[PDB]
Design a protein around this ligand. Sequence first.
Ligand code: 3PH
Lengths: 70, 62
Amino acid sequence: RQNIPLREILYQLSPYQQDVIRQTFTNAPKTFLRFFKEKGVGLATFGVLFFGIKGYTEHEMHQERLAERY
Amino acid sequence: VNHDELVKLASDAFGSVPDEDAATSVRSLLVKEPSRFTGSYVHDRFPDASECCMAVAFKGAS
Ligand SMILES: CCCCCCCCCCCCCCCCCC(=O)OC[C@H](COP(=O)(O)O)OC(=O)CCCCCCCCCCCCCCCCC
């Protein structure tokens, strides 16, 4: 099953010799900031393009409705 | 081997070994640094080996 040549030492601890969810509270703000640091540019360019084009379209639609008035 | 002759020879030869302090006995050293068993896993990987030796052990008895 796909022999891989490799030289290493691997260590593993029992899952009943460590904690489960206690470190999740410590790392939660750091992980939040790291997520937004990594995906900040893409989410921002998505938001700018989508909301800008939607806002321009809705504004010009409102102007079109106003132009039909008497 | 005769027991009395070995007693005499050991008293002549090994009679000068120091005795032991009570505070530095084997039991005090065993109490001071006790054994601990931890459930764990290790492998030593080699890139071009032929055999695969492995041992699995449980915590046994003293
Ligand atoms: C006339 C009818 C009136 C209707 C009034 C209601 C219209 C909709 C509600 C208002 C919406 C405006 C603010 C929306 C804020 C949403 C959040 C957001 O953008 O954040 C995403 C995003 C968050 O990034 P993330 O936190 O990194 O995910 O924020 C940005 O990156 C900033 C986005 C700024 C770009 C959009 C600016 C508004 C466009 C308006 C363009 C007008 C053109 C005019 C041309 C004609 C002139 C004559």
